[PDB]
Structures are given as C-alpha cells and as structure tokens.
Short mmCIF file of C-alpha atoms in Angstrom, two decimals:
data_model
loop_
_atom_site.label_atom_id
_atom_site.label_comp_id
_atom_site.label_asym_id
_atom_site.label_seq_id
_atom_site.Cartn_x
_atom_site.Cartn_y
_atom_site.Cartn_z
CA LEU A 1 96.08 -87.73 47.79
CA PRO A 2 97.16 -91.50 49.54
CA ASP A 3 98.63 -89.97 52.47
CA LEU A 4 95.84 -88.16 53.25
CA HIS A 5 93.66 -91.41 52.63
CA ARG A 6 95.69 -93.28 54.77
CA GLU A 7 95.47 -91.16 57.77
CA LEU A 8 91.77 -90.55 57.70
CA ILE A 9 90.91 -94.02 58.56
CA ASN A 10 93.72 -94.28 61.39
CA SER A 11 91.73 -90.91 62.71
CA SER A 12 88.17 -92.51 62.40
CA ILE A 13 89.55 -95.79 63.76
CA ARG A 14 90.86 -93.92 66.95
CA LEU A 15 87.63 -91.93 67.29
CA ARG A 16 85.57 -94.93 67.28
CA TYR A 17 87.86 -96.62 69.79
CA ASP A 18 87.34 -93.50 72.24
CA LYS A 19 83.63 -93.63 71.58
CA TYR A 20 83.48 -97.21 72.94
CA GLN A 21 85.92 -96.31 75.67
CA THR A 22 83.88 -93.14 76.92
CA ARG A 23 80.58 -95.32 76.51
CA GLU A 24 82.00 -97.72 78.79
CA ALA A 25 83.30 -95.66 81.39
CA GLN A 26 79.91 -93.59 81.81
CA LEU A 27 78.35 -97.22 82.10
CA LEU A 28 80.56 -97.92 84.66
CA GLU A 29 79.93 -94.80 86.57
CA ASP A 30 76.16 -94.90 86.75
CA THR A 31 76.35 -97.70 88.99
CA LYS A 32 77.47 -96.08 91.97
CA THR A 33 74.40 -95.69 94.44
CA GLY A 34 73.94 -93.04 96.85
CA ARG A 35 74.87 -94.88 100.23
CA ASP A 36 78.27 -95.43 98.49
CA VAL A 37 79.05 -92.00 98.50
CA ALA A 38 77.28 -91.20 101.68
CA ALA A 39 79.41 -93.82 103.62
CA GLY A 40 82.23 -91.37 104.08
CA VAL A 41 80.16 -88.74 106.49
CA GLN A 42 82.02 -87.73 109.38
CA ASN A 43 79.91 -87.61 112.35
CA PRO A 44 76.69 -89.57 112.21
CA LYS A 45 75.57 -88.67 115.81
CA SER A 46 74.46 -85.17 114.86
CA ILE A 47 72.41 -86.93 111.83
CA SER A 48 70.49 -89.40 114.01
CA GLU A 49 69.72 -86.71 116.26
CA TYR A 50 68.58 -84.88 113.53
CA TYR A 51 66.22 -87.55 112.21
CA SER A 52 65.06 -88.82 115.50
CA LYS B 1 75.03 -79.71 103.71
CA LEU B 2 74.83 -82.97 105.07
CA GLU B 3 77.93 -82.77 106.74
CA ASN B 4 77.04 -79.61 108.93
CA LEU B 5 74.16 -80.38 110.85
CA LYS B 6 74.98 -79.59 114.45
CA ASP B 7 74.09 -75.88 113.56
CA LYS B 8 70.93 -76.46 112.56
CA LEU B 9 69.66 -78.76 115.24
CA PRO B 10 68.80 -75.65 117.92
CA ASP B 11 65.99 -74.21 115.82
CA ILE B 12 63.96 -76.96 115.47
CA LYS B 13 64.38 -78.73 118.83
CA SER B 14 62.76 -74.87 120.15
CA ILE B 15 59.62 -75.44 117.64
CA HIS B 16 59.43 -79.14 118.86
CA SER B 17 59.42 -77.94 122.76
CA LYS B 18 57.21 -75.11 122.00
CA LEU B 19 54.56 -77.42 120.23
CA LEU B 20 54.49 -79.70 123.44
CA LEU B 21 53.76 -76.81 125.79
CA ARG B 22 50.60 -75.81 123.60
CA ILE B 23 49.60 -79.58 123.78
CA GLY B 24 49.99 -79.12 127.60
CA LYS B 25 47.69 -76.23 127.86
CA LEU B 26 44.81 -77.71 125.66
CA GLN B 27 44.79 -80.62 127.55
CA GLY B 28 44.67 -78.68 130.85
CA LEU B 29 41.63 -76.92 129.45
CA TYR B 30 39.94 -80.14 128.63
CA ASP B 31 40.45 -81.25 132.24
CA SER B 32 38.80 -77.88 133.30
CA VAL B 33 35.90 -78.65 131.67
CA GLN B 34 35.58 -82.10 132.90
CA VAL B 35 35.58 -80.65 136.39
CA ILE B 36 32.74 -77.78 135.54
CA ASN B 37 30.41 -80.42 133.91
CA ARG B 38 30.85 -82.90 137.08
CA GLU B 39 30.06 -79.62 139.33
CA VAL B 40 26.77 -79.01 137.54
CA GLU B 41 25.45 -82.80 137.80
CA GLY B 42 25.91 -82.01 141.53
CA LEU B 43 23.20 -79.33 141.35
CA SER B 44 21.10 -81.56 139.24
CA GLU B 45 20.92 -84.85 141.51
CA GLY B 46 18.93 -83.23 144.53
CA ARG B 47 20.43 -80.52 146.67
CA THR B 48 23.79 -80.93 147.86
CA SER B 49 24.57 -77.48 148.45
#
C-alpha cells in the first residue's frame, strides 16, 4: 500500500500544477486582438482599393 | 482569403461601372422631360408657332 500512497499524491499535485499552467496559458492567448494577427498581411494596396 | 483580393477586384468594378451607366440614362430621361414640358408651356402662352 504505502508505495502506491506516496505515488498518488505526486500524480495529483502534478495534475493540479498543469491545470493552473494551462489556465494561465489560455488566458494569455485570449488577449491577442485581431489587429495583431492582421498586421502581417503582405499587400495593403489591393485591400484599400477593394474597400474604397 | 484576405491575402488574395486582387483576383476579386474586377467583378465588383464591373457592377460599379454598370450601375453608373444606369444612373446616367435615368438622368438623361429626366432632362428629356424637362424640355418637352417647357415646349408645352410655349403653346399655352399666346401663340408663338
């Protein structure tokens, strides 16, 4: 028994640590607005012609 | 889809020009009436024929 006992605790601690880390990562990802992704477009000329 | 818009500029352009032509004709039509009405006034005010 005790070998499994002091393995379950390690697994659970690690699980919660990853849960925290992934919450952090998701919240960091969600702040990137559209303009940031769209700043890299190649040719603005055709776009401006289109919209005008 | 935002990258490649040079290939979709023509069609819209066409419609635009087409619309313009239509307006022109309609405008012309109104101008036409604005002459004939005037001529009819000519017949009413006395005799000028």
